[PDB]
Amino acid sequence: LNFEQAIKDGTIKIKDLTLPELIGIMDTCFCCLITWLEGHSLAQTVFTCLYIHNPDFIEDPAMKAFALGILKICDIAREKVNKAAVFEEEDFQSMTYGFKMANSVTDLRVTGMLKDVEDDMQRRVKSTRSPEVELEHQQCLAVFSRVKFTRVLLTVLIAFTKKETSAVAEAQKLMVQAADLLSAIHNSLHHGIQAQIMMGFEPLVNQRLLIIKREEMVNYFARLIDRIKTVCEVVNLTNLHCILDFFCEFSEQSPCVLSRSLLQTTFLNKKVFGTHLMQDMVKDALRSFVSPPVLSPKCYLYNNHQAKDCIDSFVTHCVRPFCSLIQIHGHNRARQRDKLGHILEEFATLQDEAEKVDAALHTMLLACLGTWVLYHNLRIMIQYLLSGFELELYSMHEYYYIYWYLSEFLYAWLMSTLSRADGSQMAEERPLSREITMSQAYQNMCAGMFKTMVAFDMDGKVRKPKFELDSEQVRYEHRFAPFNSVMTPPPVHYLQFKEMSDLNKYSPPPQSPELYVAASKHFQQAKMILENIPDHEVNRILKVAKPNFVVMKLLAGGHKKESKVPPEFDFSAHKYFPVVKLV
Amino acid sequence: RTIRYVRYESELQMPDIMRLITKDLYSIYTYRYFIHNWPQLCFLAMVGEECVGAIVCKLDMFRRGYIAMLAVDSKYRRNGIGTNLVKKAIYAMVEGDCDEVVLETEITNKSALKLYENLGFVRDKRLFRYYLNGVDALRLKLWLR
């Protein structure tokens, strides 16, 4: 029944409402909001609350204020998500289905109403602060906690909409308050009216115009508050490389669409944080990474008005690929792979422009801008390749050549780029030593895994697909198709891959024990690198490397040689590198 | 117990086809359209005087083929009926000058994934909550050229 047609009927109560009714109603509305935030529609989850349809009809101040707060939170969330545009076709449904979503009342008025309801309930709590009295006090505590949480969440969502990012620094403290509050909303959860089609809710309201359990609500909201607190700290960064690393780290956790959209909108259509210009950020990243002579204050190229109007054009050309790269990082972990594969054409164009600009600058008096663009492009390709491991898109028999591409070719180019960048940095004079070390560990892990897979295939422990029209050549060409749009580094075709990956160069050709020992030596180098440098990623890499080494050393001694069972590869320990168990 | 593989040339088997689809996993017009436009790709596995398995595919313009439905009776699984049925559809697609055979599946269907991997199919994309149930889906394609 519709709210307008039910107010006269008497099935719903708009005034003189009991505390347990409010506790249950607020809990159910919170669950509906969380369900909507998980990627579902509005007419099915949030608008099932008959009260939210027209909150002007509610006479109880508390319920009306709660409805206004929920509507305003939905407004801010929808606006931010639409602005960011980092949600897939089915990861969020932003259509409002023609609902008047509390646009008449201001947001500050809603916050004031929430504060008034909270104060006029803390007074009641203090009036009994010392069985029926105890139950009333507990219900009052529950209502006050829910109201205060609504107010603080709406306040943070409001503060995230200010033009200046500094307002976010005025909201982080509020999040701490939520830590001492959500548990309260969790503690007095058995006071609300349990569902049985609860009172005040009609899930079949919307049928001609077209949830989660309460126990999981508190933990989800706590995780979301932690995500927002993590997002808030992004305003302290000053270099594009650090922001890129921050975005990658944030996306590694698979955050909700609201968190990704909030981060995207707080980062940037033209000004970063509302303070820095993206052209200047690009120039600063160039100066901090490769230090080209043009960007040095006293290198005579800054004073030239034509080298300046050649570096600025390149910076303006590089500004859009980077915005697109950040946006691609903002998406979920499914479309990220395809968008990474597609950004390669734009970055190849950028690389060609960088090469031309560097050549012209040297001729007018090498490989500084080209080195920087190559570093970013190599990062893109490596992340694209590893994403398939993250998404279980590779079969068992595809591991060896994917890992060979990652280790022997891509990571070698990455090390050459990093070493040349550090050399140019020294020549113009260790922010990349940690990155070099991490790349060393990653490359050794990948090389060990590649040798492992090659030995497994030689031993016959890997199942291949036997059917007349399936060839490795076409599979290899299609797997590495996005790499055709790049020119430097050159794509490695199937024939060259078989030539370099062949084991007939070494006389005598290596057998399974030799390759197993080589993989063990790679894992040992990875361990000796990682365990000498730490954060969570280093611990995950070490936990994925240490048992791997002992497993391969044990297996190189002839254990389970006659068996043909395919070994299991557990990706629980680390996202990209598996722990190969023999059981 | 002799099993047989037969193409689609009659008007008696669509009622048998739907019985083998709704009991395994759509509107009747979906199957009607798919049989209409591409009758040369719909194959059935009949044992005796009944139908044991079925496959319905479409090939539309690179010329890409698509496998829409592949079902086997519960009492007749694990006998290799599905693998042969998929082979005699891939071969028909090849005779029709197709370049790639694409399909979608549930990530939970481990048996189907292993079957298509044995047939040579390689995962290309992973979709989140693609199915109406809520489970994530996997897109498997086989490239022929």
Side-chain angles (χ1 to χ4, degrees), chain A residues 2-3 6 10 17 20 22 24-26 29-31 33 35-37 39-43 45-48 51 53 55 61-62 65-71 74-75 77-78 80-82 84-87 92 98-99 101-102 105 110-112 114 121 124-125 131 133 137 141-142 144-147 149-156 158-161 167-169 171 174 176-179 181-184 186 189-192 195 200-201 203 205-206 211-212 214 217 220-222 224 227 230-237 240-244 246-248 250-251 253 255 257-268 271-277 279-287 289 292-293 295-297 300 306-308 310 313-315 317 319 321-327 329-337 339-342 344 347-352 354 359-360 362 364-370 372-379 381-385 387-389 391-401 403-427 430-435 437-445 447-456 458-462 464-465 467 471-486 489-498 500 503-505 508-510 513 515-516 518-519 522-524 526 529 534-538 540 545 547-550 552 554-559 561 566-567 569 571 573-580 582, chain B residues 2-6 8 13 15 17 20-21 27-31 33-34 36-39 41 43 45 48 51 53-57 59 64-68 71-72 76-77 79-80 82 84-85 87-89 91-93 96 101 103 105 107-108 112 115-116 120-123 126-131 134 137-144:
Chain A
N2 174 242
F3 191 39
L17 262 166
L22 283 38
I25 272 154
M26 301 165 148
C29 300
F30 268 126
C31 287
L33 166 91
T35 291
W36 166 63
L37 283 179
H40 305 291
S41 73
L42 277 190
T45 82
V46 157
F47 283 119
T48 58
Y51 289 104
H53 285 282
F66 180 92
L68 310 210
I70 283 269
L71 283 169
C74 272
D75 271 25
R78 201 254 290 277
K80 275 291 191 168
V81 160
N82 287 4
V86 288
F87 60 102
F92 188 68
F99 272 116
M101 284 218 319
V105 297
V110 172
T111 305
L114 266 285
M121 266 286 318
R124 270 174 70 164
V125 153
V133 166
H137 185 248
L141 283 199
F144 162 79
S145 294
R146 271 157 199 76
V147 165
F149 178 79
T150 280
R151 157 154 157 280
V152 300
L153 192 184
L154 176 169
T155 300
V156 177
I158 277 188
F160 255 80
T161 63
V168 183
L174 252 70
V176 201
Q177 215 170 341
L181 197 154
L182 269 153
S183 83
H186 180 51
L189 192 40
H190 50 275
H191 290 30
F201 282 99
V205 152
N206 313 296
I211 340 275
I212 48 168
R214 271 189 274 272
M217 158 181 88
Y220 173 87
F221 266 120
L224 164 67
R227 236 168 298 129
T230 293
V231 154
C232 154
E233 83 204 57
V234 79
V235 200
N236 314 341
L237 314 180
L240 295 200
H241 293 147
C242 289
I243 319 197
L244 256 162
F246 193 98
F247 267 88
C248 299
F250 193 62
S251 88
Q253 89 174 250
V257 58
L258 181 52
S259 321
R260 315 188 311 238
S261 44
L262 274 179
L263 186 67
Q264 286 286 343
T265 59
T266 40
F267 163 65
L268 159 58
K271 202 134 54 66
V272 188
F273 301 148
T275 60
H276 312 86
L277 205 60
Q279 274 86 17
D280 292 287
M281 303 283 325
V282 153
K283 290 170 183 175
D284 185 23
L286 263 294
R287 177 169 316 106
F289 194 84
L295 293 202
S296 172
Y300 148 74
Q306 96 186 61
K308 191 173 325 292
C310 169
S313 171
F314 171 64
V315 168
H317 261 251
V319 76
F322 261 86
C323 264
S324 310
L325 170 35
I326 298 294
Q327 217 176 292
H329 269 123
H331 279 271
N332 83 7
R333 321 271 311 177
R335 343 202 77 86
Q336 261 187 47
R337 189 195 213 262
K339 293 181 200 285
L340 288 151
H342 280 299
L344 269 274
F347 262 77
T349 306
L350 187 55
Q351 160 82 36
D352 197 3
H362 185 16
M364 182 254 267
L365 69 97
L366 269 188
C368 296
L369 327 174
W372 179 73
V373 178
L374 172 54
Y375 161 69
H376 284 310
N377 204 357
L378 284 176
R379 275 200 53 182
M381 311 195 248
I382 278 157
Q383 149 81 345
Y384 168 91
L385 278 196
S387 70
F389 283 116
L391 302 167
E392 335 174 353
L393 289 177
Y394 302 134
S395 299
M396 183 70 113
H397 54 271
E398 296 174 82
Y399 288 165
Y400 78 100
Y401 64 74
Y403 272 134
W404 181 91
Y405 212 105
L406 283 155
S407 100
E408 270 286 90
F409 188 66
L410 278 187
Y411 264 132
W413 274 88
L414 185 57
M415 301 306 218
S416 306
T417 313
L418 274 167
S419 80
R420 154 146 38 102
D422 172 295
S424 45
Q425 262 197 217
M426 220 54 82
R430 295 94 185 176
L432 314 102
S433 197
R434 263 268 285 97
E435 171 56 340
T437 307
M438 281 294 80
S439 306
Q440 250 171 28
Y442 278 136
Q443 187 244 330
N444 279 110
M445 275 305 288
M449 264 313 292
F450 145 75
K451 297 271 199 41
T452 310
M453 301 305 317
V454 162
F456 269 122
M458 173 189 12
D459 203 328
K461 270 157 190 330
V462 164
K464 274 133 214 154
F467 157 107
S471 72
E472 281 258 87
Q473 221 280 347
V474 188
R475 208 176 293 117
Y476 182 89
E477 295 287 82
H478 274 93
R479 278 313 209 181
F480 292 115
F483 293 167
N484 294 337
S485 57
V486 76
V492 174
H493 294 297
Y494 188 78
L495 276 296
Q496 321 149 218
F497 154 75
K498 301 298 276 199
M500 319 156 58
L503 287 322
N504 316 350
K505 307 171 229 245
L515 296 187
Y516 279 163
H522 276 293
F523 288 131
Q524 198 131 53
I529 284 169
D535 35 27
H536 313 121
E537 181 46 3
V538 170
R540 267 200 311 274
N548 242 356
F549 154 81
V550 64
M552 282 296 137
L554 163 154
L555 167 77
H559 172 244
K561 158 80 72 192
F569 290 65
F571 282 87
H574 186 205
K575 205 153 33 147
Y576 304 130
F577 302 106
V579 167
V580 46
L582 251 185
Chain B
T2 302
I3 85 157
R4 205 166 75 264
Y5 304 72
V6 47
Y8 192 22
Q13 289 131 358
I17 286 176
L20 211 29
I21 279 310
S27 82
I28 193 166
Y29 285 125
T30 278
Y31 331 121
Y33 149 59
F34 264 69
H36 270 213
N37 275 105
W38 304 274
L41 297 197
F43 285 84
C51 164
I55 169 150
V56 153
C57 301
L59 178 172
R64 146 189 313 134
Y66 184 110
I67 302 173
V72 187
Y76 283 148
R77 281 163 222 245
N79 281 37
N84 299 327
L85 212 53
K87 289 184 59 44
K88 276 167 65 35
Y91 282 147
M93 211 155 288
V101 186
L103 82 89
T105 165
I107 192 161
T108 316
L115 152 63
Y116 283 95
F121 271 63
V122 187
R123 311 168 191 178
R126 168 210 270 278
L127 329 169
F128 281 145
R129 299 97 121 289
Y130 174 60
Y131 277 26
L138 258 53
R139 177 90 54 77
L140 271 76
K141 34 182 81 173
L142 178 67
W143 302 292
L144 304 321

